């Protein structure tokens, strides 16, 4: 699959029971961040779950629900979750999909070449079942949930306000926390941008690079 | 394509001339980070190029060569690079592929659904020409080259020292900047880990979760 | 495609916005001249745009609308048109198509063998959406818009009056600015042509070669 | 798969390392009994692992090496094996395959209809790599390793002594622990059986039903 | 065919006449055990028909009807049944299918690789026409009808009480004749188990290993 | 298969052991008569076996070996033959093929439509492996071995003396036991027949209907 | 085609005109015997036609109509029939098909290997258009219409009275002209056979071999 | 195409205009003779046109319209006809088809192997649009229109009188100008011919060879 | 097949034996005329055989061998030839093919639409195996061997002298018995034609219509 493509209609067994994706979340009017991990009872995967659990409320506060998956079975999932609770006193409270035969994984291209388990994939899906972003980190390198958070915050504001976010937003090197106006793509639109700048409605480096505050 | 797969043999037109990937870089013993952008003379893309140029030295220092691409032609590239010089006072010194008909973009799944241009993809390829990581951000959300920098540093380190990096390394919530020992996957490897900690030599939360300083 | 064939129904993105061909022009009861150029910011193409713009009203006055096409994206298109106004003090005012991946270019056979950009093609399409003439010039040789003007003028007169135009009309070596009567195709029509001679209403070299003043 | 067929060539990841089947055991001139279980950390499966461990040297003594499998991953396997040790005081010492995506399971028809995990299958393979017997029990009913043991004992004997084993051997209702001579299949063999009976060299109910002590 | 699949609808010729499977038995609200044997007038098969007849009423008590099959013809079946009667004073009173060309045998994978007759297959089918278990023993090794009885008793109780049976039930080494509660597969179910144990009607080794008496 | 074709190379299991046809007989410079019957222990079939046996030596003296075929197995064959000895005092001494699944039968078209057993087929094959005649009688109507004897005798003479045999030979209504000269098929051959008539070395009704004594 | 198959609907040109097979005969409620011969004006074929004509009334009596076939054309057929009358004092009065290109011949497998003309085939088709028997004799050996007469008489009685006919009926070596009762094929039928005999009205050698008079 | 088939529906361009074959003639109740010639301005072809023109009224009286064809274009046809007029003082008044790409020529098999022009083909087509005769002479040998005239006359009479014409009719060596009665093809027809013969309206050499005065 | 196409390699049965075409004739350095007739013992066909025999030596003299063919068998052929000898005192001495199944007839397209026998075809094949001319007359219209003779004579002369024969040669309306010079087909050949005339050698109507005495 690819960005812009609606998440496939699929039923999955999870630590919270059998659910329908993307329906289960879209009907609640929520976005969701599906992410995979190579295997239960593995170190990096464990650190990422602790990290994600420490941030679950931030994603939720934005209306984005985290949901995980690996090719292990649900009983292993629960025993691994219990391990995390008994040792790190952290209680995982988001669902984890048990993709028994890695069927959903393969469909989403989460399985690396010649492997039989997933890598570290991330799929941001909105309240309309649309895939908005995709990340494939390798098994040997843990992700940074803080960047994924910046990504989704940016994704929400882009949809809400109809603007684009610059590099490293809200800490862009050129315009700080200002947002970008989609570029004019017609002779007529170019005129409007120039008139808009004249009225002080927007700032710009050129007719195609306009920006402003939120 | 997917992680672990070898970058495809392709001849491309760049602002530094016609080259062949991944050969051009691998024969120089260099890694390379290929990244795409929707189009020349567009706001977000420009802020990303500025952001990349500011960090190019840090990438090259690690033996990773940046190279961009869009579906525009090479003459527009140089004209846009000239605009960046005349307006942002920085000179792009990394090659940029002119994927004229988006043949390469399509082969690398860079084209979002229903679009005729690329989104913001990133492919990290090592000196053996193997795709090590892939990122797909939408046109509306610029990337954060610092997270990508952290990604490649992690990748270089895991390849050179045979370790795995924990979530948000080197600032992990559990083991700070320490690295992780690939989990034992056999009864024997398990025994070796249990004894390995019987007398220093390594730290661990469990036999499958061992870590150390690098 | 070939002469006599209906211009294909297609949606195109231009400097004047999105338009459906041949619909956009055919419903105005106008003809259009679709011509392509290798790339934006290239010398020969620039000279042809200068040439076309200076002749635009001559085509428009004949009910013929010029529209360009390149494999570049629309933003470069506008940047280039801007360079043309700032350096050659010429204001391009005909739409230019941004055939992003050369989809239309390929369907129209505009891309040379072993190339990824268009050559210098021209398609004359009448108010019926019918292709009346096609021209394919290579990147290294600019066209001559005056010969194309003579082409369109001959085409319109041919349709309007039901006559044929001799070599180099209206400056033919044998009959000058006179036109040709489509040749008799039957025994009876041959007789009609002969009676139309000798105490006749027509000039001719033979029964199949009849001509007259327009 | 069906009886008499050759066990397919395949690479499997097990708790004892990666090996190739059937080669690994057949190249050693060994037999092996591959059996599956639905999933790690499930009750019936645990009672069967306990039961099998209690009988491993019984099968080994016969030259028959036991090897299990489920679609769980190896790390989960080792942990489950650890649980059995700390809660049932028994150390599983036979390898267990991690059929990550149920690839081998599907190949051997171990997956019941509508399921995404194995049922309780048993395959008896000899040193020639030939499947000598197959059992498919459902998830809800545990097997009986004693019947499987009787099964392999009869198989080993029939192979080395060229005899058949009656129902419930060595406790057959009709001939106790005596074995059966493969039935005469030609007029000539029938003759030599009637003659072998006349000289008390064999006991029989008829010419096709001859039996003897080992 | 595999466990869980519905037994195929087929018309078979038997010693009791022509009947349709699984209908003939399902419409009576009964289960049936279909088993095959290499050939009529062979020793091992004869010991099995004797063993089956002596246990036919115990199968019938549970509402399970035994029905045999071989690639021999009906006339031979009856003569063989007649032989058994005259030489072993046992009357066979279960139907035997004359699968003339082994068409049904092949559909059910009863014919060993490189063979022209069936092996010793056993199919347990419930009143809903669903295959609950399958067994394939080779020609050289007779089955043990008591293990099949244990298997069918477990199946019946499993379907009635919604429980699972432990290894060697009702003689399991760990819990004897006690049955197993299907393992909790969700976080919520696990909680119900922990509360069911601590002050409740449930014994357990862990939240996933719960059991009770019948 | 049809007359003229060489009998198919096939291995068959018979009451006299496994043999390869037609090799088994052709190597002995023998002809063979392969015939089938619906099933063992059936009336018409028993009457045909009694008749064949009473004529077996008659076929053998002509260098023709009889060999039966049934879709029954070999053990039933020997049992049925035993029944013939004990009830009719006749000792069957020709081999009978056990075509377990009717594979050879189907290859030779011996299975009537909608049936799963053979009809009453007869194939006469010569020492060269060539099928010389084919007969298909239905199950309800027994054959007459005397007519097959006539057929075989005529066949032998036809091959040895290059003559053809008339209707009901050697009791033909027109020429009794005299044989027929293959008809002249060329103008020249017709002349050498009209001559043979002249010097009375041939009798004839016409140039194409010549006959003589053996 | 094979016994039991419906005779193919086909139109044929004959010496008695064009007719539709098998309708022409079935609609009259009659049976027919279709027989072929290699070619007109050949000796064996001639003796066979003479032989058939002398028995036509006996076939007709039984409600069976003979009809010939060969690849010659109808004109030769009539000249040959004329030769037969002029030289043998016999008048052929049954239809003979002119299978011009051997299309029906090929359809019914009458053409021997490598030939372009039929062999001596015979098809007995009943009033239902069902092929009841088939015979393929070679060109060098004429048939015996008396055997086919015996065949058809048995076929009719069998169909009429629901009985089977023994070898050489009505001159069976064992039971003379008595007919056979189709063998009991079930345990129940066997019982009713034993009751029909022993203080009953049926003769038999065993329960499956019962016979009586008409 | 072949004799007996319907002439193909085709629109053709001729020296008399565009018409539809065979309709143009059939809807008028006229037959037509389509004849091809290799090329315009070729010697043999010219002598044949001169030849045809001299006999056109002969064909026309019989209701048969001649129409020519070659792969030349219509304008050349007219110039050639004009040439014929100016040099042979004869006026061609039959239409000639301009089969530009030889589409009809190929469909009618008028193109010899390895050629791209027609040979000298002749098609006689009746008022029912049925092809009645076909001739193919090579380029090097001119035809003889008188034989085609005899052919069309015989063809017409045959259709009107329902008779066949002997060799070289009406100048047959055996029966002069008499016609032949189609041969009896059934026994019944043979009888009527012998009746008509014996004192009747029929002469003959045999029952299959009847003739009479027209 | 068409003109110029090589005659197919084929073995045929004829009244003169089995021969291979076109080899049999080509190897003798002879040409041959293959002609077919609908059926033996038919009127028109018989008149054509008589006609051909009377002219056989005329064809044979030109080195052309006649050979006939019908879908009848050889025996019937010989009897028909015998009838012609007995009644018309003429002896057929040319071979006649027995195309038993009409396979060669079909291959050469001698079978009219919806028929099962050949029509009246003629094929002239030269000593190189090339079909030089083809004629297809209907069953109802006899041919005229004198026209075929003219064709063959003209054919032999064109090959030998490299000239073309005008319409009705040697009785052409324009140039009588003179032959035609193949037309100049290049500017240079046109020159020499005019030169050839400038000084005797050839007579002409134009540069493309040149003729000379044979």
**Could you please report the per-residue DSSP string of I23-34?**
HHHHTTT-EEEE
Chain H hits for I48, Cβ within 8 Å: 166-167
Chain G hits for H187, Cβ within 8 Å: 15-16, 78, 81
Quote the CA–CA distance of G179 and A121 in Å, as a whole number. Answer: 82
**Strand duo C31-36 + C120-125: pairing:** antiparallel
Helix and strand numbers (H, E) in chain I are 6, 10
Chain H hits for I154, Cβ within 8 Å: 140-142
Query: How large is the angle between the packed helices B145-161 and B43-53, nearest 10 degrees?
Result: 40
Q: Whose CA is closest to I185, among H68, H86, H38?
A: H38
Q: Whose CA is closest to A119, among A44, A38, A33, A42?
A: A38
Chain C hits for B116, Cβ within 8 Å: 100-101, 103
| Helix (H/G/I), strand (E/B), else coil: G130 | strand
Q: Which domains does chain H have, with CATH numbers?
A: 1-143 (3.40.30.10), 144-214 (3.30.1020.10)
Q: Do B188 and D17 touch (CB under 8 A)?
A: yes
Q: Tell me: is residue E120 an annotated ligand-binding position.
A: yes
Residue H48 corresponds to which tokens in the numbers above?
């044949």
**Strand duo C120-125 + C131-137: pairing:** antiparallel
Chain D neighbours (≥3 Cβ pairs under 8 A) are A, B, E, F
Quote the CA–CA distance of G82 and H186 in Å, as a whole number. Answer: 12
Residue A177 corresponds to which tokens in the numbers above?
């926390």
Q: Do at least 3 CB pairs under 8 Å connect F with E?
A: yes
Displacement of CA F140 from its chain's centroid (Å): 20
| Buried residues in C76-113 as b, exposed as e (16+ CB within 10 A) | bbbbbbeebeeeeebebebbbbbbbbbebbeebebbbe
Chain F neighbours (≥3 Cβ pairs under 8 A) are D, E, G, I
Helix and strand numbers (H, E) in chain B are 7, 10
Q: Do F75 and D187 touch (CB under 8 A)?
A: no
- How far is residue A186 from each of residues B116, C77, D94, D101, F98, measured CA to CA in Å? 17, 10, 71, 51, 86
For B68, list phi and psi in degrees, rounded to 5: -100, -175
CA angle, corner D131, sides to E10 and D184, nearest 5? 75
Q: In this structure, what is the dihedral angle of CA atoms A63, A66, A67, A72, given to the nearest 10 degrees?
A: 180
Residue B52 corresponds to which tokens in the numbers above?
């990349």
What is the Cα gyration radius of chain F?
A: 20
State the catalytic residues of B. Answer: 45
Q: Evaluate the omega torsion of the peptide bond into residue G170 and state whether it is cis, within 30 degrees of 0.
A: yes
Distance from CA of G142 to the nearest CA of H (A): 26
Q: Which residue of C has its CA nearest to A190?
A: C78
Q: Which residue of G has its CA nearest to H209?
A: G75
Q: In a mutagenesis test of the A interface, which of D15, D38, D70, D76 is the best target, namely the one with the most A β-carbons within 10 Å? A: D76
Q: Do C187 and H75 touch (CB under 8 A)?
A: no
Are E39 and E69 spatial neighbours (Cβ–Cβ below 8 Å)?
no
Residue G178 CB partners (closer than 8 Å, separation 6+)? G166, G172, G203, G211, G212, G213, G214
Question: Beta strands of chain F (E only): which ranges?
Answer: 10-14, 17-21, 31-36, 64-70, 96-98, 120-125, 131-137, 179-180, 203-206, 209-212
Residue with tokens 């090197």: A173
Query: How large is the angle between the packed helices G74-88 and I74-88, nearest 10 degrees?
Result: 70
Displacement of CA G185 from its chain's centroid (Å): 29
Query: How large is the angle between the packed helices D74-88 and B187-196, nearest 10 degrees?
Result: 70
- How far is residue E106 from each of residues A108, E32, E97, E115, measured CA to CA in Å? 38, 19, 14, 11
Q: Do A116 and D101 touch (CB under 8 A)?
A: yes
Could you give the residue ranges of the DSSP H alpha helices within H54-99? 56-61, 74-88
Query: How large is the angle between the packed helices B43-53 and B74-88, nearest 10 degrees?
Result: 70
Chain I hits for G69, Cβ within 8 Å: none
Burial class (CB in 10 A: 0-12, 13-18, 19+), H1: middle
Residue G193 corresponds to which tokens in the numbers above?
């056979």
Annotated catalytic residue, options D12, D21, D33, D45: D45
For F98, list phi and psi in degrees, rounded to 5: -105, 95
Q: Whose CA is closest to E69, among E126, E108, E115?
A: E108
Chain G hits for E81, Cβ within 8 Å: 187
Quote the CA–CA distance of A43 and B180 in Å, as a whole number. Answer: 7
Are G73 and I71 spatial neighbours (Cβ–Cβ below 8 Å)?
yes
Name the strand (E) or helix (H) holding H197: helix H187-197
Q: In a mutagenesis test of the A interface, which of E182, E185, E205 is the best target, namely the one with the most A β-carbons within 10 Å? A: E185
Distance from CA of A152 to the nearest CA of D (A): 31
Quote the CA–CA distance of D143 and D140 in Å, as a whole number. Answer: 10
Residue E111 corresponds to which tokens in the numbers above?
């014919």
Quote the CA–CA distance of G211 and G180 in Å, as a whole number. Answer: 4
Please give the DSSP secondary-structure letter assigned to residue C179: E
Residue B35 corresponds to which tokens in the numbers above?
């990244």
Residue F100 CB partners (closer than 8 Å, separation 6+)? E71, E102, E116, E117, F13, F71, F73
Q: Whose CA is closest to F63, among F150, F127, F129?
A: F127
Q: Which residue of E has its CA nearest to A97?
A: E186
Chains A, B: CB contacts within 8 A come to 206
User: What is the arrangement of strands in the sheet containing F203-206, beginning at the earlier edge strand?
Assistant: F179-180, F209-212, F203-206
Chain B hits for A106, Cβ within 8 Å: none
**Strand duo E131-137 + E179-180: pairing:** unpaired
Residue I184 neighbours by CB distance under 10 Å: 17
Residue H185 corresponds to which tokens in the numbers above?
């093809």
Distance from CA of A18 to the nearest CA of E (A): 9
Are B23 and B65 spatial neighbours (Cβ–Cβ below 8 Å)?
no
Q: Do F74 and D185 touch (CB under 8 A)?
A: yes
Query: Do you know the residue count of chain C?
Result: 214
Please give the DSSP secondary-structure letter assigned to residue I165: B
Distance from CA of E66 to the nearest CA of G (A): 16
CA angle, corner C9, sides to C4 and C15, nearest 5? 110
| Buried residues in D50-85 as b, exposed as e (16+ CB within 10 A) | bbbbeebebbeebbbbbbbbbbbbbbbbbbbbbbbe
Q: Do F41 and E102 touch (CB under 8 A)?
A: no
Chain G hits for I75, Cβ within 8 Å: 39-42
Are B161 and B214 spatial neighbours (Cβ–Cβ below 8 Å)?
yes
Distance from CA of G43 to the nearest CA of E (A): 45
Please give the DSSP secondary-structure letter assigned to residue B101: T
Residue F62 corresponds to which tokens in the numbers above?
């002509």
Are F50 and F87 spatial neighbours (Cβ–Cβ below 8 Å)?
no
Chain A neighbours (≥3 Cβ pairs under 8 A) are B, C, D, E
Tell me the CB-side half-sphere exposure of residue I155, using CA atoms within 13 A.
27
Annotated catalytic residue, options C45, C69, C98, C210: C45
- Ramachandran region of residue G30, left (φ > 0), alpha (ψ -120 to 50) or beta? beta
Q: Do I16 and F188 touch (CB under 8 A)?
A: yes
**Interface residues from chain A to E (CB-CB < 8 Å):** 13, 15-17, 74-75, 78-79, 81
Q: In this structure, what is the dihedral angle of CA atoms D2, D4, D10, D14, given to the nearest 10 degrees?
A: 90
Annotated catalytic residue, options H21, H44, H45, H179: H45
Residue I163 neighbours by CB distance under 10 Å: 20
Q: Which long-range contacts (CB under 8 A, 24 or more apart) does E104-107 make?
A: E104/E10, E104/E12, E104/E69, E105/E36, E105/E69, E105/E71, E107/E1, E107/E8, E107/E10
Are B181 and B212 spatial neighbours (Cβ–Cβ below 8 Å)?
yes
Quote the CA–CA distance of C53 and C48 in Å, as a whole number. Answer: 8
Quote the CA–CA distance of C37 and C42 in Å, as a whole number. Answer: 9
Distance from CA of H155 to the nearest CA of C (A): 32
Quote the CA–CA distance of D123 and D117 in Å, as a whole number. Answer: 17
- Is D45 one of the catalytic residues? yes
Quote the CA–CA distance of B118 and B140 in Å, as a whole number. Answer: 12
Annotated catalytic residue, options G45, G180, G181, G204: G45
Chains C, H: CB contacts within 8 A come to 24
Quote the CA–CA distance of D135 and D1 in Å, as a whole number. Answer: 12
Q: Do at least 3 CB pairs under 8 Å connect E with D?
A: yes
| Helix (H/G/I), strand (E/B), else coil: C194 | helix
Distance from CA of F186 to the nearest CA of I (A): 5
Q: Do at least 3 CB pairs under 8 Å connect C with G?
A: no
Chain C hits for A186, Cβ within 8 Å: 14-17, 74
Residue I87 neighbours by CB distance under 10 Å: 12
Displacement of CA C132 from its chain's centroid (Å): 8
Quote the CA–CA distance of B211 and H186 in Å, as a whole number. Answer: 105
Residue D177 pairs with which residues in a beta bridge?
none
Quote the CA–CA distance of G81 and G66 in Å, as a whole number. Answer: 15
Q: Do G13 and H185 touch (CB under 8 A)?
A: yes
């Amino acid at each position: 699959v690819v960005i812009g493509e609606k998440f496939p209609e699929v039923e999955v067994k999870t630590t919270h029971g059998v659910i329908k994706l993307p329906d289960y979340f879209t009907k609640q009017g929520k976005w969701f961040i599906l992410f995979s991990h190579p295997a239960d009872f593995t170190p990096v995967c464990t650190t990422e779950f602790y990290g994600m659990q420490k941030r679950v409320e931030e994603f939720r506060k934005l209306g984005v629900e985290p949901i995980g998956l690996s090719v292990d079975q649900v009983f292993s999932h629960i025993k691994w979750i219990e391990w995390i609770k008994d040792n790190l006193s952290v209680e995982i409270d988001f669902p984890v999909i048990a993709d028994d035969r890695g069927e959903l994984a393969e469909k989403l291209g989460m399985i690396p070449s010649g492997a039989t388990i997933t890598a570290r994939a991330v799929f941001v899906v909105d309240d309309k079942g649309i895939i908005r972003a995709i990340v494939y980190y390798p098994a040997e390198v843990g992700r940074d949930w803080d960047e994924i958070l910046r990504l989704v915050k940016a994704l929400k504001i882009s949809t809400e306000k109809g603007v684009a976010l610059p590099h490293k937003w809200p800490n862009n090197e050129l315009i700080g926390d200002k947002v970008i106006v989609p570029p004019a793509s017609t002779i007529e639109e170019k005129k409007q941008r120039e008139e808009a700048k004249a009225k002080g409605e927007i700032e710009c480096y050129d007719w195609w690079f306009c920006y402003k505050k939120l």
